[PDB]
Amino acid sequence: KSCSKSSANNPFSNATVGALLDNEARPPACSYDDNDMASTMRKNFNKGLFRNLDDVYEVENSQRQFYTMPVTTAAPDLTAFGQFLYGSKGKTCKEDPSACTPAFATR
Amino acid sequence: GYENSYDANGARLVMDGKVVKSECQLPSYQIRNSKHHTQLPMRSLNEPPPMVEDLVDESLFEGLQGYPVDEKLDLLTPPGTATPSSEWAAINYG
Amino acid sequence: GLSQLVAYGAQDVYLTGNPQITFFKTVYRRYTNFAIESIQQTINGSVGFGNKVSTQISRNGDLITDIVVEFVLTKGGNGGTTYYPAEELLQDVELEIGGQRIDKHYNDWFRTYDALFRMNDDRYNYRRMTDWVNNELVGAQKRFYVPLIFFFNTPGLALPLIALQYHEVKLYFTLASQVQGVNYNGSSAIAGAAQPTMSVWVDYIFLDTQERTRFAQLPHEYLIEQLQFTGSETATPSATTQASQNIRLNFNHPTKYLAWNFNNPTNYGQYTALANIPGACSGAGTAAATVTTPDYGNTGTYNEQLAVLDSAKIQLNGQDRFATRKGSYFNKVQPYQSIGGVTPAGVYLYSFALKPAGRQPSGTCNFSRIDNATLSLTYKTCSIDATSPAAVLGNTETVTANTATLLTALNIYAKNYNVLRIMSGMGGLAYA
Amino acid sequence: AGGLSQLVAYGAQDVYLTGNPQITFFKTVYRRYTNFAIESIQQTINGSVGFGNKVSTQISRNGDLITDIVVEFVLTKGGNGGTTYYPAEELLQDVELEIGGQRIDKHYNDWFRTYDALFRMNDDRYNYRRMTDWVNNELVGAQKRFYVPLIFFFNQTPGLALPLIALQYHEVKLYFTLASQVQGVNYNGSSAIAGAAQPTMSVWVDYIFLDTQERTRFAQLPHEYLIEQLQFTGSETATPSATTQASQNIRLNFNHPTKYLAWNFNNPTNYGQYTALANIPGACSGAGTAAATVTTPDYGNTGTYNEQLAVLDSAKIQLNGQDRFATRKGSYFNKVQPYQSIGGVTPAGVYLYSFALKPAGRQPSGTCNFSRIDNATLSLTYKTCSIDATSPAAVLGNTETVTANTATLLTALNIYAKNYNVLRIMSGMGGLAYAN
Amino acid sequence: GGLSQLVAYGAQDVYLTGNPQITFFKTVYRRYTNFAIESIQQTINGSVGFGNKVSTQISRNGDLITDIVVEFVLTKGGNGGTTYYPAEELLQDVELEIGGQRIDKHYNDWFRTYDALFRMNDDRYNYRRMTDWVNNELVGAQKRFYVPLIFFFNQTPGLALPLIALQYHEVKLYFTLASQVQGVNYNGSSAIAGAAQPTMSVWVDYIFLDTQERTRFAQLPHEYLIEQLQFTGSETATPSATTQASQNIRLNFNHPTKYLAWNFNNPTNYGQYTALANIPGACSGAGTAAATVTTPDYGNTGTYNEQLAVLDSAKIQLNGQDRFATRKGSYFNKVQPYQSIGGVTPAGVYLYSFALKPAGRQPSGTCNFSRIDNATLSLTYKTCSIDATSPAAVLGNTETVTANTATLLTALNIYAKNYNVLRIMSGMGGLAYAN
């Protein structure tokens, strides 16, 4: 959907303080698989970094220490976490009398 | 201030003490026209699949690491036919 | 760990490039919605020494797995006078489906099986459930548990009673007429000894609706194991020579392995010669030692010097199937390679399978295509004076104790595969 | 092989240091500079020179710009070595700089001592001592000429040379106060020294003579000189006590962008005494022996680095009642602040708190503007004066929160602040732009 | 907190931080031409020994040269207290010549004067550690000493000599070793039997430049401002015990001079710029019965005690008119260094700067004596009436007097450090102004 774009000033779209005066209610970064922002993330990642042509696997430049935090928006998005843990299987046995099965409640 | 060099992706390469001016200085340029076998960076696509586990097969085998023989088993270069230029791993920095 | 991640080269591509798995995230393949219940079976016939009893397994669950026979025995003597007495008591068990014999275990088989396939704490715990292992004294009472060792007794396998609506599954158990340290001491009966109490327990699996229906209605072909057994006279070992013998093996079916032992029929589990060295005979190591009676609680031993097999080879259709090897090969190396446990002296194994301890076939010898299968044995010379520890312990490879000539019985086993076909409520074996 | 083998080993990590290499180290280009000459000229001192007298001088326009000013004094020792402590520093009780009738700045003998304690160092500090005291065990009657440099903004850097040339209608004057008494010269503690000589004084101004083009521009162009000023508030110290930890909250009536604050506690009786007296070597007259008195300092060794004899336990500065920084121990202000901000060593009893990254330099590097702080306060906590000053075991083996019983004599507090203002010069006149 | 200072913003802050131009929290370092440095031993010709003259040609090994360190191995001919900067004393003089053109020439006394005036703090101490025995060493002790040269190209990378640009002109250093060194082969006037001759080695620190710079240095012409030492030795009007001797010394100096420096000394005792006295450190055995005011405590030859200095006052006159008001010798000893150097100068050594910062490389005001027909240094001496053997007299005296032993300080060394121009082109070079 509204996948954010890792820019030259924020190469990983991590939203540290990068939401000030430009998208304070920032949408999520990118899924990193869908909408391949990985190549442009690495392209933004260098912007004047000089590799030694001996590090052919792109690992000596401490790329493992760079990533995207699980929350890239201004909120922790507790509603998604809450809908992820609970909220599913609407209309419980207590309310409407069709979803009960002779056993007890779900666990 | 090297605004005119070989940008790999976002990085400027260095091979023999000097910044790589153009693609003609890289070693990959000597095999840039051959469909290489593997590209050395090896970016994984979409996560790897999980490790499926079960208590039936591991208990029935009692170890014995039963390996399947109906796989693809990607061959190597026959000794007679040299080594195809395709066997050189491309190190596409950019 | 960053300093290791940076150490990445061409040699690693074979291990981690285009990765297929991850160790840090697992998923399970199998699910259940199944329950397990322990249910007592009714025993028909009278329980007692020397009696035969039987039970029909009740159709309480859909599938069954473990079967444990409980036996209450009392001590007719002191600690050290018994040896796996609950194992000795259960002389044998037949498994029958639809009236067809499927299999049969023997007390000696349980002992041989254990000797080869159980191990470590598993083995100790087994001993705890079949013997007295904390120096119990005369009059002590104990409830023993003898698990059965049939083809359906690993958690991934079970017998589909639900798929056998018209055929009963029965167990026929023979109780020994005598059990050492319980109702007999060597050849003498123990006055006042109690008769055993027996109870048969079956662990049942209750399946959900879909799993249950499939078992109940679909045809099945279950790869099962069976035990073949032939008892025979041992060429008697002698101080004067190396006895030799050729035993014709009337075996059939894809066989995972062959196993055998030599024993003294008088003393259950005695697979070795008796000697005046600690544990090797009653009172061994001291003045009271007798090399005519074992230290029953220490009947088994790893000291190959008391074993009688010098060497052996198995001939198939007149061909030698392997080069002749020493008894210690069969006793120590074979189980090292094929099982991973430790086999006591006097017990031998030869495997045709990579891992006979599993369920999955891993190489078998099909004896249904073998017209002439023969076990060729060479025995050790029985020249060592069993009452003199120096003679017993300082000797050579080709000799054993003079008391080794008492191991006159030979038990040869073969464990094989068959196919148990079940359909339309009935079933039985494809091959016999 | 050799140095060339290092040059061979070039990679990506070098680009950041030598790629597209900008500058070198092996080709210095010196800049051509305006032609000038420097001359030391004696000024006429008006008023009588003597102890306790006030004198003054007007700097004549002999040259175009002025910088360094040194005041010479000739004194004779009133006692033997060990009786004086920076006596020429003590003698110059104060100096006031006025341009066109407007006070620009004013320094005090104690300020010179505080300044030195914080900002001069190593051989500079020693040479300074050589110019203001007797440091080669000179004896009574010994005569010496002392040179006391002034430290006004134009007396520290050529960059702020005062443009007398552009002050054609405004006189520049220095007013000096000579101390009524100088220890070991005309008085020994409270006792006058009979026969002590009166000082001979001379004020030397080092003038810059500019060439024609530079001279002309100075004479006609307006100028804006960023200058330093010293603010000072003297006050009573909550008297330290053997019975407790005295405390005090001092309103700081300071203004302007302040580079730093500095302060000390002292006993006005003895110039430069910022610590308590004790019977340990150098800590009192006769210290270390039977004749030691912890009522009089070893004047020649008045200063010390032994913080055990200092009185500040801790301090903080508040701005409008809010803590500026967390409360820190007196030893923080004495040792760490100057370590970090100056790079020298500060004597016990003298404290510094900077608002600047580099307070020892000319270029502003962070300031606290007290002209916009309605109520700044210095909050002090003192050490408990329970240590028997006459017993080294007690003096030297004691705890962090205590000091000498003789530390209760350190009742005066001097708080200084150095700030930045603007001196504007135009059409022959000039003065400071910000009054408050 | 810190925030409470940031908000205290008003009109007086505008002149410090309004419309800010710079910061302090983002240092971007300047990139620089890549180079490497190697210390390389030169071959020194001529027998090495006391009183001998030896020399070396610097090979064109690297591209540029800077530091030169002369190593010497000396041994103690007596106990601690008998030597004073003996490796410095040993190197009597050093002459710098390019293509047969003298560029400069230094004397052991200059090294001592230079140090006394311009080094300081731990630099001065570390220096002493490389030229003397400073850990109370005993007779027979052997040490390697390192005497850095102080020619203009030996003080900064900025003036490294572009040897690469001098294909046809050699650079040579001529060194003279003193006939005698105190506490090494002589003790006062007495030779020390069995004294060893010194071992000498000369090391030149070469700069190896990367490719583009080597090319430019080799082909482009160069011009450097350089420093030179002018030196005129002379007799001091003999100081007198009866009056204040005085002397007008015509200064035969030339070129834009950064500063003048001078000292008075007893030519017998290296580094002695002050009178001897029976006060601790001021003479051999000072402070006790065995004290003599005829021999110094060599290990403590120098002092900051002005009472032992000879000069009363001085001025510099140019073409008949005073250049500045007459000031006391103590002004040239303590104040000039305060103002211009920031270190501490030993008694008997004087400085008068024409430069704002004479200790630096950048010219900051000079006196061009090539345009002063008659420059004169005018010196007035103290009356040498103080009985050097009596501390009461030595220490309790007046400004205008000194020790009777100050009359031994009859040698005067006047130095002038000036700026000249070194030009190098097409493989050759030399100076714009000859002497």
CSV table of C-alpha atoms in Angstrom, one decimal, chain B residues 1-2 14 16-17 19, chain D residues 10-12 15 19-20:
chain,number,residue,atom,x,y,z
B,1,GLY,CA,35.1,14.6,-4.2
B,2,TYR,CA,34.8,11.9,-6.8
B,14,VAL,CA,39.0,1.0,-4.9
B,16,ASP,CA,44.9,-0.7,-6.8
B,17,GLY,CA,45.1,2.3,-4.5
B,19,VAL,CA,39.4,4.9,-7.1
D,10,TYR,CA,46.9,1.9,-0.2
D,11,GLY,CA,43.2,1.0,-0.1
D,12,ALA,CA,39.7,2.2,0.6
D,15,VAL,CA,40.5,7.6,0.6
D,19,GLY,CA,41.8,10.9,-1.8
D,20,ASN,CA,41.3,14.1,-3.8
